[PDB]
Symmetry: C3
Subunit: 279 residues, 3 copies
Amino acid sequence: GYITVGNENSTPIELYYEDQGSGQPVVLIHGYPLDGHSWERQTRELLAQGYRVITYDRRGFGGSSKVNTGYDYDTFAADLHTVLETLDLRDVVLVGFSMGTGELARYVARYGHERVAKLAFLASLEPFLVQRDDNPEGVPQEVFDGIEAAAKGDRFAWFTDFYKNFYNLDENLGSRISEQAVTGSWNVAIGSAPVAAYAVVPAWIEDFRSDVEAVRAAGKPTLILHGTKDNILPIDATARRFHQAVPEADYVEVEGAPHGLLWTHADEVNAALKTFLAK
Amino acid sequence: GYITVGNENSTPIELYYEDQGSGQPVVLIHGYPLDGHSWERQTRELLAQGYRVITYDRRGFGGSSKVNTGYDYDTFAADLHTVLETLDLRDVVLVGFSMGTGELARYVARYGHERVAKLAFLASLEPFLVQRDDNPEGVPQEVFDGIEAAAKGDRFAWFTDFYKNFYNLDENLGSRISEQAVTGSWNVAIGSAPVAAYAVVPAWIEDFRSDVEAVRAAGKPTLILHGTKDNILPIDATARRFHQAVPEADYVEVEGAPHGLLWTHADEVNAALKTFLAK
Amino acid sequence: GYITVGNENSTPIELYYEDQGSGQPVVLIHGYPLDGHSWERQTRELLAQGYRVITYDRRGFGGSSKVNTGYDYDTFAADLHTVLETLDLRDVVLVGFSMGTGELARYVARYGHERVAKLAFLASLEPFLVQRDDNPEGVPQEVFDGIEAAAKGDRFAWFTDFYKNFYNLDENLGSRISEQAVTGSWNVAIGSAPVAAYAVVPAWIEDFRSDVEAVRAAGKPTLILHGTKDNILPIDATARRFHQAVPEADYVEVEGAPHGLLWTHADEVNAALKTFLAK
């Protein structure tokens, strides 16, 4: 399916989406640089549990418009807003992974939470990833400058390097992810808009601290889940701070899990989501 | 092109299709887990012979909607019905390969054959693939349970394993199919809906014996063709039984050919189709 | 985005396109067998310079309709005409690479140049590639017969062989193009219509000499640029003849560059385009 969310010059900006099953709606918002099918090990379990599972592809990724403009969380949240309004979803469970955790918080901040039943943040960006004078816990800017330069420099070679760290392949290749599944991740990645490989870097490092205040003040059931061996989003720079800021959230650390834990630790992710959604 | 065949929640179910050439219409219905381009070695010959060649992609595959629902032959036949009605095709030659042989028989059973000139069944599922008390010639259920578990377990690794047996690669790699063509088959496969990798297993093993009665009673020119080294659909469990049940059909065994014979034995397939369509 | 340019039987022929930025419009027309994203190293620079950058995918390629008909430059030029009329582009800079250089010349010949500000021909087909009694400078027909047979014979293996010569991989693999970028080129190539792999061969070798007269007589700023180690379009059979025929054009030979110089020599291409567009 497609939902129109805007225009880029003479072209409509269309987000590809899938809408499956019946029951309470659950919207899964994928990470960089994948698409809605990256949720497959979660989707099939949620469908079996009697939820209506919707995924969509972020602008620039998967089946969505390969735009040049709007790679920022105000825009990504406006896109999500349009998806929820177009489908008129109520009592929705929002689930974000990696980049998708940004949509959840920015959406609540900008649009409120009348439509939202629950929020699940998996491998979160929050609260503020890049080190600044007022954010000493963050990661030095130079890391992101280097990533931006690599992704712009040759996105094809970059995605290979990125997935090594995404999945902790030295540890997990052949035990928790096959060579073929890694190749599938790469094939999806290179289909994204060339500019999207690096245009998202500034979005990743936006300050979400005020959005985290909105999320906490909403008082809706919230889950924060992270792998302890996440080498993309270091657990001390993200989830542990997010947990400190939102102590009411259910909190899960998946021992030994990498960033790419929807696949490598699908069982643990599924168990946490099953418990959380049953509340 | 796209033809709408239904809805899955808020999304239309759209089948991708191609409609080329001029002359008597011939509809080619591809096998798992490929798409309409898998017919390329046949398509170009039929076009050169002065036929109008139409292919479409089965739901879940190729360019068609990546649905969760309807992976069964009643639905696959209803999809075909909608394609034929939408395009208002008359005197059509239907040609199925592997899964596509199921559409042909179920379509005739459910909708009749007023629009149909001829039927060609290549690498057929018929008559009933899975062993049961009333179907002693079939293959034990455990084979299909294992396939379903592998395809659900990791579809990326599964497609690699599947294509080895699909093409008899130990025999044919480098002589009747290139490494690059195998890779092309895999790239197409992983684009299918994640759920479609395994959701089709129960469809493959449906009982087609009553549909075979409908096909035989139609009395339209019929071709049944199979490779003698088909390790996906064993010739004694399928084509030889189908031939016994429909003795009026033209019958071709392609000596030494695997399941993937549209590619590896394109010449033999083309020669059989040319003769058959000329009648 | 899509622009409808015709019909093939029951299906509209739709060209995929992207329309980005603001400023004077620049239309980039890709080479075989790639798509509009192959321009990525040029697109991002032109956008940064304040141009509106449009690319589209040639019929049969990339995201465009996978047709069987119209693989000839009269049709390719009519497609371009429809793109320019549909978007109502004025003062447009047309930039062609490899096959795209054919659209530029045939378009001016058939439709004039009222909408066109400037023309840039990169790795040009012009003036007439195949040797004939009245074209002694051309390449013997047998070369093209061999290519057509290889591309029809197994397009998957063919694209691998083609890209070796496209990029001069013996020289450039690992220094000016990564293995991963080569794989990205192959993944895009195999997505093209099966018939398009070889149907374009006769189009490549059309006589453009009368079109070159139209281009020269237009008197619009023109750039001709070619790599000196182009092993796909030999510089003496193409650019040097084109330069002799249109001496008013700006002329650039990129020392040591292969056919695939948008990627391998992006800096040199970008520098030439920046200078040319600034005029």
